[PDB]
């Protein structure tokens, strides 16, 4: 049975590689504190305080907390991530299991200056999953508070909150309030455990590979085309130079002129920034020159935006202003961190199919030329979908997110999340957890006011998550060797992806998925 | 099994709408304190202290406490109440379940100035239901201490007491004393739980609708009657004007004169008060002008009294003095609260069938006229049941009571409770709960006096209540759209029926049931 003196689960951290499948399992130790002193609170921000209109909000913070494993380093060790990206053309999630076990509730009393902590054996926690998607879904915004990448670390559970419609700092009639105690929930004492299972819906494999061809090079280099293009509008001669028409076939020496079947993907142009700072304009342009969208009178940066190549050849010092993912190095500051404290990703691989984020999409015609008027052209800085476009998605990273919830709407176009990962109409459900309030002694004459005098408590336990992943094997006939992700050979003060002398785990660099190649 | 380390129940708050039925379930957290230091006490009030004869009483307070869920906001969220009142002509209760679980007994010791709290694992609580209706039934007086409307709040359990017959502050031979330890009771330690079920007896549906016709307008407007009425007692002419008899048929232009089948319901007249205070008489008349009944030498206000319309057309600023239900706004004072701190209900819908509370019922004849004496009339300020009367009951509110117990008597007339809701001869039974006394250490030489030295204790737990309700669907052929209960569209500082910045839940207004319409 389950009692005070027996454990309700075991520690599972493992990975198993079987054929076309890999199964990861992770266990961590968590600590859960009481939030808001058991209260729900209205929160808002408005111009009155001095915020700009672009930052206003209205919402609620709750006493509850939630579990989040939406980063890949929750499930994969760095060596496992190497096995995946060097050997496979793609992967996708299939199913998951979740367990919550070995739960301990503790009470802390304050007397004079000294603080003491004891067990409370009869207290509970409450847990439920939102399986019908009835709550605002705050997973998928890339918040802090996921399970830690390193299995020995103990993490704090984050507080749940949400936003609803606002006008300035005020609410409107359509604004919704939610009470989370209004769902069914399971209550657990120190001997109880909790578990559920979930199945992923069909989703396309993430493409982990780069193309070894480019979209404008798909032709046979040895042969002419049978089609023709207009090669000459004027006679080339001694003196006159009158109007003429002349035509040529496309061939090996004019590839720019040949007829083609396909177009590069869409473009929304970003401003370019150099990591060599003396090359940048001297001014503070991050917001005023930023790439933005405009919704209901608010301006919001398109960050990272649609997938575009970070730079062209030999340009690596440049990046789009708001167009890339940027991670932190360990102990990086929250505000105004220096360039040496952060890690910049590069989407450079998709340069074959996708326009570079800092250039125009192309050129079109402005006017109607004639004998009287010379022709004029114009530059295309944003281009939506054209028939014949092909494109790649943004890459995924070991530090980065896995899935997002597709918003429930009448229409969408190519619902792949812009921060990267798998779009899901029915994502893995969110998991809510709370300490049950325990009153301090009531008065001995009746009073109708709600009791707000409590014994301070927190809880701890273990959590397990297990995901099964499907693999897509690499089939290539390429003769020469591939690029692989590898560790450095040379000696160093510390080992990458390990602890230091102080005990702190760190991740030296971001690692994407695209190493193997494939024909376009 | 059930032990210290396992939970004995789960959190259920939900509503399920199925066909003609809706099922509500609510869970709250409660705290129970020791009352009267485990004693029974005689209580009384008499003129000697300076109370008036109208307020005297004799009775007993007990160490026990009781559970009360007799308000509708215990079972319905504001959105659920909207679903009910906008879509349905009626509803009634069918059956209920009750659970009591996850019980924690705590002991508190006082030393010097510091106070400490610990678990006591072997202590019990006692619980019983009075299924045979053998105790004075104090539910149905609209007392404070029901389960809170908002599910996250923790509430204190109220102390049980009762009154018996008095003469002044003294008792009489017929007065009864009750010991609640003289019933069988269930004892629970921290692993035990308690439950029972109950079935409601057949009761008429509450009418949630207003009439779209009035009782004096039921005729066909296009046609004459074949009956006649006395239209003239005197000749209309040049000079003489002698006695005559003349007769006319009732028709479209005289509806006041037509013959009719039915009468308005009963009347007991209330004094009228304006919310514009400059229109009221300058004097303190609330008690001296109040509407009263008289029983065994005591005067008691008829509050709210029989169901009557609050005001007539375009009169909304007026209300009957003691004739309506009045709720409080959050943080309203207990005594001498201002008009802006309270919420006044309106029975305005029943104006079609029911007399207005502040006017006479009608006119009758005083005398016998003749050639010598002119006719005299008199005003009817109170009227009991006449054959041919029809009437509506008072409406129910989300903040208001659900049922009352019909007193056990030889006779009653239309036993619908005057504060509103369902009259029941066998109501849901009352549920009594108490902490079992634990002695402090006794002396080591025997003493016969009862031990009155105890360890201070209180308990906490969860309580669940589930009610199934039957619905009566709306059948109407009305072409134009109905009135509906709706939230306001415009922006505001807070959301109605939510928490504020401080965490306090409030209810902005009272909400009745009558929106849909029905033919008379």
């Amino acid at each position, epitope marked *: 049975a389950d009692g005070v003196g027996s454990s309700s689960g075991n520690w599972h951290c493992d990975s198993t590689w079987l054929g076309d499948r890999v199964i990861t399992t992770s266990t961590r130790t968590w600590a859960l504190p009481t939030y808001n*002193n058991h209260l729900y609170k209205q929160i808002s921000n408005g111009t009155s305080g001095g915020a700009t209109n672009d930052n206003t909000y209205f919402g609620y913070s709750t006493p509850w907390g939630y579990f989040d494993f939406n980063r890949f380093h929750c499930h994969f060790s760095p060596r496992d991530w190497q096995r995946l990206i060097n050997n496979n053309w793609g992967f996708r999630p299939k199913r998951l299991s979740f367990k919550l076990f070995n739960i301990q509730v503790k009470e802390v009393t*304050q007397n004079e200056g000294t603080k003491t902590i004891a067990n409370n054996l009869t207290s509970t926690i409450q847990v439920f999953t939102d399986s019908e998607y009835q709550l605002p879904y705050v997973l998928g915004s890339a918040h802090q508070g996921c399970l830690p990448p390193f299995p020995a670390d103990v993490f704090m559970i984050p507080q749940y909150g949400y936003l609803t419609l606002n006008n300035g700092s005020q609410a409107v009639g359509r604004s919704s309030f939610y009470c989370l105690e209004y769902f069914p929930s399971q209550m657990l004492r120190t001997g109880n455990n909790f578990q559920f299972t979930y199945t992923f819906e069909d989703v396309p494999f993430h493409s982990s590979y780069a193309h070894s061809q480019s979209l404008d090079r798909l032709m046979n280099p040895l042969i002419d085309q049978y089609l023709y293009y207009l090669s000459r509008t004027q006679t080339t001669g001694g003196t006159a130079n009158t109007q003429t028409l002349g035509f040529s076939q496309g061939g090996p020496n004019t590839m720019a002129n040949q007829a083609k079947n396909w177009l590069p993907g869409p473009c929304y142009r970003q401003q370019r920034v150099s990591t060599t700072t003396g090359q940048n304009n001297n001014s503070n342009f991050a917001w005023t020159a930023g790439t933005k969208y405009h919704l209901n009178g608010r301006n919001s940066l398109a960050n990272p935006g649609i997938a575009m190549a970070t730079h062209k050849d030999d340009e690596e010092r440049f990046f789009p202003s708001n167009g890339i993912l940027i991670f932190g190095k360990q102990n990086a500051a929250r505000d105004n961190a220096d360039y040496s404290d952060v890690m910049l990703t590069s989407e450079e691989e998709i340069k074959t199919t996708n326009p570079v984020a800092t250039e125009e999409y192309g050129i079109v015609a402005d006017n109607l030329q004639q004998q009287n008027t010379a022709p004029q052209i114009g530059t295309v800085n944003s281009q939506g979908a054209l028939p014949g476009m092909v494109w790649q998605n943004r890459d995924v990273y070991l530090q980065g997110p896995i899935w997002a919830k597709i918003p429930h709407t009448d229409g969408n176009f190519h619902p792949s999340p812009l921060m990267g990962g798998f779009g899901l109409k029915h994502p893995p459900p969110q998991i809510l957890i709370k300490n049950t309030p325990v009153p*301090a002694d009531p*008065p001995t004459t009746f009073n109708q006011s709600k009791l707000n005098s409590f014994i301070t408590q927190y809880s701890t336990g273990q959590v397990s998550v297990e995901i099964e992943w499907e693999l897509q094997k690499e089939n290539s006939k390429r003769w020469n060797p591939e690029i692989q992700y590898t560790s450095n050979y040379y000696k160093s003060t510390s080992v990458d992806f390990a602890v230091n002398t102080e005990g702190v785990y760190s991740e030296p660099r971001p690692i994407g998925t695209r190493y193997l190649t494939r024909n376009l | 099994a059930d032990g210290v380390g396992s939970s004995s129940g789960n959190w259920h708050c939900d509503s399920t709408w199925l066909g003609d039925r809706v099922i509500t379930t609510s869970t709250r957290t409660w705290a129970l304190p020791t009352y009267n230091n485990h004693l029974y006490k005689q209580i009384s009030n008499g003129t000697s202290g300076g109370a008036t004869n109208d307020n005297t009483y004799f009775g007993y307070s007990t160490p026990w406490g009781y559970f009360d869920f007799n308000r509708f906001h215990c079972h319905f969220s504001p959105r659920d109440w909207q679903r009910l009142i906008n879509n349905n002509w009626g509803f009634r209760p069918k059956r209920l379940s009750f659970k009591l679980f996850n019980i924690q007994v705590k002991e508190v010791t006082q030393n010097e100035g510091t106070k400490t709290i610990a678990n006591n694992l072997t202590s019990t609580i006692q619980v019983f239901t009075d299924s045979e209706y053998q105790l004075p039934y104090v539910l149905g007086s609209a007392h404070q201490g029901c389960l809170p409307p908002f599910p996250a709040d923790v509430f204190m359990i109220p102390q049980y007491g009762y009154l018996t017959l008095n003469n002044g502050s003294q008792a009489v031979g017929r007065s009864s004393f009750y010991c609640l330890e003289y019933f069988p009771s269930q004892m629970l330690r921290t692993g035990n739980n308690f439950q029972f079920t109950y079935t409601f007896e057949d009761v008429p549906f509450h009418s949630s609708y207003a009439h779209s016709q009035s009782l004096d307008r039921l005729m066909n407007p296009l046609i004459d009657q074949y009956l006649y009425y006395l239209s003239r007692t005197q000749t209309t002419g040049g000079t003489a004007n002698t006695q005559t008899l003349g007769f006319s048929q009732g028709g479209p232009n005289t509806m006041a004169n037509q013959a009719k089948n039915w009468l308005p319901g009963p009347c007991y007249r209330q004094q009228r008060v304006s919310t514009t205070t400059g229109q009221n008489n300058n004097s303190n008349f609330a008690w001296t002008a109040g509407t009263k009944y008289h029983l065994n030498g005591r005067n008691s206000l008829a509050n709210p009294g029989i169901a009557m319309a609050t005001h007539k057309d375009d009169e909304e600023r007026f209300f009957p003095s003691n004739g309506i239900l009045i709720f409080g706004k959050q943080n309203a004072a207990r005594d001498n609260a201002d008009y802006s701190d309270v919420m006044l209900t309106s029975e305005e819908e029943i104006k079609t069938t029911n007399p207005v509370a502040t006017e006479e019922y009608g006119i009758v004849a005083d005398n016998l006229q003749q050639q010598n004496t002119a006719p005299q009339i008199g005003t009817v300020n109170s009227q009991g049941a006449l054959p041919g009367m029809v009437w509506q009951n008072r409406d129910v509110y989300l903040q208001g009571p659900i049922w009352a117990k019909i007193p056990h008597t030889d006779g009653n007339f239309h036993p619908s409770p005057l504060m509103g809701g369902f009259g029941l001869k066998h109501p849901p039974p009352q549920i009594l709960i108490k902490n079992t006394p634990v002695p402090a250490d006794p002396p080591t030489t025997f003493n016969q006096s009862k031990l009155n030295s105890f360890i201070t204790q209180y308990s906490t737990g969860q309580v669940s209540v589930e009610i199934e309700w039957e619905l009566q669907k709306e059948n109407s052929k009305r072409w134009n759209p109905e009135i509906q209960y709706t939230s306001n569209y415009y922006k505001s500082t807070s959301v109605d029926f939510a928490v504020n910045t*401080e965490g*306090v839940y409030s209810e902005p207004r009272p909400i009745g049931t009558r929106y849909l319409t029905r033919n008379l």
Partner: nanobody
Amino acid sequence: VQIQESGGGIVQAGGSLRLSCAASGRTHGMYAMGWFRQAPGKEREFVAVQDITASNTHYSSAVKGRFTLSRDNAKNTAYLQMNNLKPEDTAVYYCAAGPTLMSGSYNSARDYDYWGQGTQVTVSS
């Protein structure tokens, strides 16, 4: 929701001084009412706190055995009576209020929403 100080003054050592505090509105607020003090050039220190029903009360170690905290819900006010004053009790006392009382966290300033202007109490020997 204004808290307001009163009863400030200067006293000789051993005297009995009484600080007072009042609020306006939200009796569904002001659940817990308490006192802090900040001496010249020093950190703010929690002095006392009591809840609405008077069930739970706490005093600072230095404060205990000399001060008593009392409360009147009718007037929506709270009082602090002070006995056997020592000149290290010169400080600026703040009335403080909050929606909740916790057993672990009550002595932290993080748990109080509202703060008065303060009072100066001087104690001389």
